[PDB]
Design a protein around this ligand. Structure first.
Ligand SMILES: Nc1ccn([C@@H]2O[C@H](COP(=O)(O)OP(=O)(O)OP(=O)(O)O)[C@@H](O)[C@H]2O)c(=O)n1
Ligand SMILES: Nc1ccn([C@@H]2O[C@H](COP(=O)(O)OP(=O)(O)OP(=O)(O)O)[C@@H](O)[C@H]2O)c(=O)n1
Ligand SMILES: [Mg+2]
Ligand SMILES: [Mg+2]
Lengths: 226, 227
């Protein structure tokens, strides 16, 4: 096997997907092979497609998915609305373990936060991370409330002996502001901040995104991933 | 003693203060004596005073505060920015125990979500809840992401054997969209949903707010909070 990382977040819209892309771009620039798996995608009627974003921003081609629900709802809600079950636990775990290989960094993007339902019956990204021995990268905000949400997520991680690989601030505002600046230090007191991605990066072209990503993570850590 | 409920939430801004007032109002109309306590209060330089707001909506006169910081930040940050310190754990617990009394419902509103630091070192409303043997009423949203936040919070409550007294949806939109309705059902499957306060409730005057409050909760549950 190689390195499987699950990329989770304290909530939805924290920039989990752009963090996947940024880490992918960095790791690829370290000459590491990257695959990204998004098992379940919602919001497909309006063009939600997080694996496509990873393809565009980072040029990952190993992009693996199992289900697409039109509604921009939580997966189980989208499933109920669409009239179809979620994927099975086995489908998810085995698709992921089949992507994994020596030399490869495999990022797994859930939907929303850590405890949202991803497969039948009521199994979460946390469970998946356990089944494949992956660590968790926690994408966080710099906004008021991020501390509570982070401590909650790291506690849930530890409760199932899922390791915490660090935090990434999904979107670093400009100018920061007093609350965001204070939160970045506090966040650094509970886990290793790996990067803070400038707000708006999702709009860069691939060259600029690759440059951003190269400068956002510690190169030694990234290399040290696989 | 009496009954102590901590009134916590899935995050900041979810409606904790308004729930304190609404449950206080319903319990008062049931003839139950209510104290509301706000040990760590931030944002005073912006006029944030949660105790005053409970008094304004519910007429609760038995309001107890302790620490007040000017900036609208996490208490640790507001304290560091004012040149002040956070209270000690036993100061907070002392404040709560002095209110407790047979026949009284004592609501304790936190600062933000359950794991915010209230006292050094890293003392939270959960530790305080264990100290005063309270149950936790968890205020949640109907918005996308609320299931995850709710489950995380309950898991953190059960981690220390702090009992969950139920959830309250702080702000319930009328009409509820697809996302709101769905979340309300799922929340009803995770824990007892005790009330779902209508959005904008802070705009109702004394009589309308008291009507809303009594209708919001199960009469039997409110009466059952205190013997
Ligand atoms: N440094 C960043 C971080 C986020 N975004 C943008 O802010 C939004 C949130 O980021 P996204 O990665 O899509 O959200 P996720 O955390 O993956 O949440 P979910 O998959 O549940 O939608 C996106 O529209 C994205 O374009 C950005 O432009 N620059
Ligand atoms: N049913 C409700 C709930 C909230 N509000 C309003 O929405 C905002 C948030 O409600 P509040 O109780 O103050 O949120 P809190 O959880 O108390 O936020 P915090 O304690 O962190 O300040 C307030 O402006 C309040 O007037 C409302 O009108 N009707
Ligand atoms: Mg995403
Ligand atoms: Mg409040």
């Amino acid at each position: 096997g190689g390195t499987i990382l699950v990329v989770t977040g304290t909530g939805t819209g924290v920039g989990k997907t752009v963090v996947c892309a940024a880490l992918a771009s960095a790791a690829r620039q370290a000459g590491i092979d990257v695959a990204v798996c998004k098992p379940v995608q919602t919001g497909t009627a309006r063009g939600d497609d997080d694996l496509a974003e990873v393809g565009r921003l980072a040029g990952v081609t190993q992009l693996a998915g199992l289900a697409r629900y039109p509604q921009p709802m939580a997966p189980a809600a989208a499933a109920e609305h669409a009239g179809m079950a979620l994927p099975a636990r086995d489908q998810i775990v085995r698709l992921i373990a089949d992507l994994d290989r020596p030399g490869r960094l495999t990022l797994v993007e859930g939907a929303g936060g850590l405890l949202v339902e991803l497969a039948e019956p009521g199994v979460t990204l946390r469970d998946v991370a356990v089944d494949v021995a992956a660590a968790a990268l926690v994408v966080v905000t710099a906004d008021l409330g991020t501390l509570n949400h982070t401590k909650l997520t790291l506690e849930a991680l530890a409760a199932q002996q899922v390791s915490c690989a660090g935090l990434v601030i999904g979107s670093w505002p400009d100018p920061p502001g007093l609350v965001a600046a204070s939160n970045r230090s506090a966040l650094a007191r509970i886990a290793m901040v790996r990067a803070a991605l400038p707000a708006g990066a999702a709009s860069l072209d691939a060259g600029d995104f690759a440059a951003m990503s190269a400068a956002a993570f510690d190169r030694n850590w990234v290399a040290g991933l696989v």
